[PDB]
Amino acid sequence: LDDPVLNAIVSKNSPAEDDVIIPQDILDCVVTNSMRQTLAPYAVLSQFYELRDREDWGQALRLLLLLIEFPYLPKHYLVLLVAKFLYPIFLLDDKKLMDEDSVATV
């Protein structure tokens, strides 16, 4: 949601991305802001979005599951992540091969 959040988490503590942060034309904090620790679960959601755009289905699924399993994310964000992301994109998932372990943990 919007772009300055987006920008800042994905540019990390390296000068990556040319996308200016906030409504300012500054490149200054596009070489800083590596959403980590507390912002780590939040960082991982924005990155899951980057991965769809850079056409990964494998690493994309993986990031989405990681957050679903995390017991310190709310329980009420169950039906929300699966309904919007996993449910339409049923095909892409279906193509991929899932073992006994991944299925049982989910």
Binding site: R36, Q37, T38, A40, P41, F70, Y72
Partner: peptide, 14 residues
């Protein structure tokens, strides 16, 4: 591991 660590200590105190 980062996120788990910090929150896991936080519950234990609480």
């Amino acid at each position: 591991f980062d996120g788990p660590c910090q929150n896991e200590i936080d519950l234990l105190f609480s």
